[PDB]
Design a protein around this ligand. Structure first.
Ligand SMILES: O=S(=O)(c1ccc(O)cc1O)N1Cc2ccccc2C1
Ligand SMILES: O=S(=O)(c1ccc(O)cc1O)N1Cc2ccccc2C1
Lengths: 363, 363
């Protein structure tokens, strides 16, 4: 039988999460020896990651914390932590321990399947119940970036363990493709977005891809990456680019194509998606990444996927012309290291915000 | 005879600077009635702007404040404030007051001519004397953006007064062109940068300009702006784009052109400069706007000019291919309002930084 959850949360929140690189993930084996190691690692690391973020949930404004949906998500995290605590005294040598552990991780993954839209309902509840205010809004924005990135990282750990120690492509290591053909993923995302655009508008822009392999001009561009994450980002970007193009060309039968450039440099693998969808004023760019205005978290969650392995996703528009979106990825698996929020004094001080006049003038 | 400077600094730092819009600047007349109004406005507003920024100088780390060059600049600001204090009890009705005031502003402008490189020497002195540290560096970056923007605004006020109440183009209102042809300024900046590039490399990329006037496809794009500021930004951008293009093409006789798009939307006038100079990894972009790494303040000062009337200057590269730089300006004179730093509690808290582990994980 287990201690009360707060005792575990306090214990594990003292540790910092331990970021892994893509190479470390990829170089992990599938033997029983490896499964025991994964077990002993995860029964420490998953509680550390769960506890760290649960401590930050507590820093949210009372208004947001008081909402039923935020309380519900909190309750899922508590149960998931306790599920893992059941394994603290279990023997990795016992095969039943390992199989039970995998079952528990699957149960946790399912429990948390709807976390993103449930948190979004919490934001809506806060808005509806109290009205929004600038201070709470900035805290929510800061928190949600970290909460959703934390969640991405926990899902990564769980998927790697369950996929490796249970198909489509046996060459993958869990969810990682050591030879991801970037243009192929671009095409897959385009194809799916085209189906949607065609359904609603009966037309869609064509795709043009150009590759720039700086060091090896001949060679098709590949990388070590999780194709599902790359697909996610590109699909969201294509949906926006397609909608802009069609909606800004209502009187036209000829649609400008969406142009994608994939560039491979010494350190970056960059993917630029350029549309001629008429663009958006600079003032309105920030809103596209806001959880508050978006309550529709496609763009901010996509940018988190990019940031997760030390990349980024940036938007640059020319109002009256169109928009460029750029996904920046690390070219090398050794540079592709998890970006994980950590609960400490610096994190804590960020929530300690209050209402005041800013450091810049008003007329 | 005058009070000690600190008594004036305390008095005037209580007020907030008053931001003017481009339209307000432009709608100001040249009559004796207007000169008296400009006088009575500036003998309050200039002391307010001087005092506000002098109070922030005092928040710099002792290490930076202790440098001879920072002390020298401080001493200039003190004398300039006192110069204006001489006018507090003077009669605007007396023509000698007005003429003496204009002389005093000219003297102040000359006194402060070398502020930018003198402050940069202060940064170098801090580096040489103590070695740099991350906390001081972040404070310097925050301060210098505000200090240099404050300086831009003070020079704007002084130039407007001296130019209007003392040529090349009588249609200008002080330094403001109500009908600035943007492509003409682009060409002027290109021409000057080409002279420099040709001198050192014996070759330079060609220029291609495209305009997108969204609402009036025929019409050449014009705006209300200070052409010297726009020229400054474009010249710096062309120098970087040209150098990148030539240096990345050492073995080539054919240079890719620099492409400029000028787009006019409902709210933004955007100028994009695109080069194929091989680009720079994302990791190194931030450094381009850093005063510390730049000690060469061309890019950060250019971005301040853009920000001064509520615009921005952004860089986006594709490593292995090239770089896009975008100047965002407000299309409408009514939206073009001075962006002025103000000394208050929010400003004060920014300098109150200390050394600690960040809110994100290390391996
Ligand atoms: O704001 S956007 O410029 C835009 C945003 C994100 C993106 O990835 C691509 C884009 O092009 N764009 C989205 C959209 C939708 C309907 C009608 C007009 C527009 C304009
Ligand atoms: O970093 S840049 O990508 C670059 C920076 C700013 C800019 O306006 C345009 C640019 O293109 N670029 C500057 C430079 C100089 C010499 C050799 C190679 C490079 C690359």
């Amino acid at each position: 039988s287990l201690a009360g959850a707060p005792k575990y949360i306090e214990h594990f929140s003292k540790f910092s999460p331990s970021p892994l690189s893509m190479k470390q993930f990829l170089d992990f084996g599938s033997s029983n020896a490896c499964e025991k190691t994964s077990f002993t690692f995860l029964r420490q690391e998953l509680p550390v990651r769960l506890a760290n973020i649960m401590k930050e949930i507590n820093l949210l404004p009372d208004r947001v914390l008081s909402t039923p949906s935020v309380q519900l998500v909190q309750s899922w995290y508590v149960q998931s932590l306790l599920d893992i605590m059941e394994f603290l005294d279990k023997d990795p040598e016992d095969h039943r321990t390992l199989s039970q552990f995998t079952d528990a991780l699957v149960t946790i993954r399912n429990r948390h399947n709807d976390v993103v839209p449930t948190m979004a309902q919490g934001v809506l509840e806060y808005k509806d119940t109290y009205g929004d205010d600038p201070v709470s809004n900035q805290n929510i924005q800061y928190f949600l970036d970290r909460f959703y990135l934390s969640r991405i990282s926990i899902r990564m750990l769980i998927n790697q363990h369950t996929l490796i120690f249970d198909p489509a492509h046996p060459k993958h290591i869990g969810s990682i493709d050591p030879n991801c053909n970037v243009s192929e993923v671009v095409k897959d995302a385009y194809d799916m977005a085209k189906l949607l655009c065609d359904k609603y508008y009966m037309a869609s822009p064509d795709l043009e891809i150009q590759e720039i392999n700086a060091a090896n001009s001949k060679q098709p561009i590949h990388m070590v990456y999780v194709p599902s994450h790359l697909y996610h980002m590109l699909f969201e970007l294509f949906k926006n680019a397609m909608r802009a193009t069609v909606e800004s060309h209502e009187s036209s039968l000829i649609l400008p194509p969406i142009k994608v450039m994939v560039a491979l440099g010494e350190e970056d693998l960059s993917i630029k998606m350029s549309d001629r969808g008429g663009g958006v004023p600079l003032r309105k760019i920030e809103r596209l990444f806001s959880y508050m205005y978006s309550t529709g978290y496609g763009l901010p969650i996509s940018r988190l996927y990019a940031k997760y392995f030390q990349g980024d996703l940036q938007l640059f528009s020319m109002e009256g012309f169109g928009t460029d979106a750029v996904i920046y990825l690390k070219a090398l698996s050794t540079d592709s290291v998890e970006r994980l929020p950590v609960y400490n004094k610096s994190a804590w001080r960020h929530y300690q915000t209050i209402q005041e006049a800013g450091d810049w003038c008003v007329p």
